[PDB]
Amino acid sequence: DHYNCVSSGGQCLYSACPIFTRIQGTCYRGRARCCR
Numbered sequence: 128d129h130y131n132c133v134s135s136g137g138q139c140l141y142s143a144c145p146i147f148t149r150i151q152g153t154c155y156r157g158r159a160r161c162c163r
Contacts, residue, residue, distance in 0.1 A: 129154040132161035 132139050132154050139154035144162035152161045 128152075129159075129161075132163075135161075135163065137161045137163035 129139050137151050139159045141159045148162040150160045151163045154161050
């Protein structure tokens with residue numbers, strides 16, 4: 128979820144994860160991705 132994404136050092140996006148990161152889970156009722 129968003130809170131855990133941010134606490135773990137990731138950020139939520141509705142587009143692709145930046146090339147230097149990879150998906151770690153989801154955010155925002157599952158509609159975004161957590162990237163780190």
